[PDB]
Amino acid sequence: RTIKVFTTVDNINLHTQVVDMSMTYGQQFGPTYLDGADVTKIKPHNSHEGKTFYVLPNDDTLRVEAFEYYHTTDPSFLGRYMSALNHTKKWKYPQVNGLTSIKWADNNSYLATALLTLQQIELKFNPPALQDAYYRARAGEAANFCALILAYCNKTVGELGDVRETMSYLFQHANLDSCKRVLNVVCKTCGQQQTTLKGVEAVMYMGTLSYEQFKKGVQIPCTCGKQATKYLVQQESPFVMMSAPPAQYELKHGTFTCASEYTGNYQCGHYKHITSKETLYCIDGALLTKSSEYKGPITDVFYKENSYTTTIK
Ligand SMILES: Cc1ccc(N2CCN(C)CC2)cc1C(=O)NC1(c2cc(-c3cnn(C)c3)nc3ccccc23)CC1
Ligand SMILES: [Zn+2]
């Protein structure tokens, strides 16, 4: 009982291997990886026929090099990255409206939306190999950056993803120490409670798409049971990301940087990227659509920032 698959050690040369289905990939090839997953302790599936597997034997110098260059301690990182890279190298990366995008394939709508957003926000990555991949992605060659996004998010090629979760994971690898957010929460029976958030917690919010509604005050539930009002007191970050579950929202030109439109059910839909240039543009992978006004199911909105201070007494 066998299947025929392809193995690779360099992502350039493929070798047809006949694999025995009664043994795991590990006992036949050593550390084996497929589309961003570790298949070492897994027995071959019928679906694996014709697929390309990355083989990466265990070397202690590789593990140490991964900590220094990728900033990871997961011994499967390199193999998951290399195996995902085999697939992301097969994708097309068109320049849509001056930005590097990804032509739709293997449910990568979320990857394209994240990639297009990353080109419009001031960000510097701490892992040296991630920052190098980021520079190359901005210049057009984005296959390595995409494989690293899948690797840092623990995702596989073909598996749908959330743009907000992807951003959350990537921001943990960005230098956001100088980012600061001061919030005040007011409950009629609890009082006022000021909170100071730093790093990723200072640039992301879940509950509303409007940065103006956040500045004015938003209704959140309090630990007492009553409703409280949370509002933005101070903000010191180069950008802000306001997210909420997909809902019909009106995007007015020049009021935001870029946004993520999500159409369809939870974990079933498709992403489109809306960006505010001289007019509103909608980048749907390799497709582009102009428009003066916009209303659709938005789930993420990014705004520009330097320093904000509330005028609320
Ligand atoms: C595409 C995808 C892949 C993967 C994961 N997960 C997220 C949870 N991780 C732990 C595993 C991966 C989610 C989505 C996803 O659908 N995320 C979004 C989303 C959609 C709706 C939604 C849309 N229509 N309807 C009826 C509901 N509700 C939401 C509520 C809260 C938050 C997000 C919601 C569009 C942001
Ligand atoms: Zn309270």
Residue numbers in the entry: 3 to 315
The authors write:
The SARS-CoV-2 papain-like protease (PLpro) is a cysteine protease and a domain in the coronavirus nonstructural protein 3 (Nsp3). Conserved across coronaviruses, PLpro, along with Mpro, is responsible for polyprotein processing, which is required for the generation of a functional viral replicase. In addition, PLpro functions as a deubiquitinase/deISGylase and is thought to modulate host innate immune pathways via cleavage of the posttranslational modifications ubiquitin and interferon-stimulated gene 15 (ISG15) from host proteins as an evasion mechanism. As such, PLpro is hypothesized to be an essential viral enzyme, and PLpro-targeting antivirals may offer a differentiated mechanism of action compared to antivirals in the current therapeutic landscape.
A crystal structure of SARS-CoV-2 PLpro in complex with 4 was determined to 2.59 Å. This structure reveals that 4 engages a region on PLpro that overlaps with the substrate binding site but does not extend to the catalytic triad active site. Compound 4, like GRL0617, binds in the pocket formed by the flexible BL2 loop and forms critical hydrogen bonds with Asp164, Glu167, Tyr264, and the backbone nitrogen of Gln269, as well as π stacking interactions with Pro247, Pro248, and Tyr268. The catalytic triad is shown in magenta; a catalytically dead construct of PLpro (C111S) was used to generate the crystal structure. The C terminus of ISG15 (His149-Gly155) overlaps with the binding site of 4. Last, rigidification of the scaffold via introduction of a geminal-cyclopropyl group in lieu of the pendant methyl substituent resulted in the lead compound (PF-07957472, 4) with an additional threefold improvement in biochemical and cellular antiviral potencies and also a reduction in the apparent intrinsic clearance (CLint,app) in a metabolic stability assay using human hepatocytes. Here, we report the machine learning–driven discovery of potent, selective, and orally available SARS-CoV-2 PLpro inhibitors, with lead compound PF-07957472 (4) providing robust efficacy in a mouse-adapted model of COVID-19 infection.
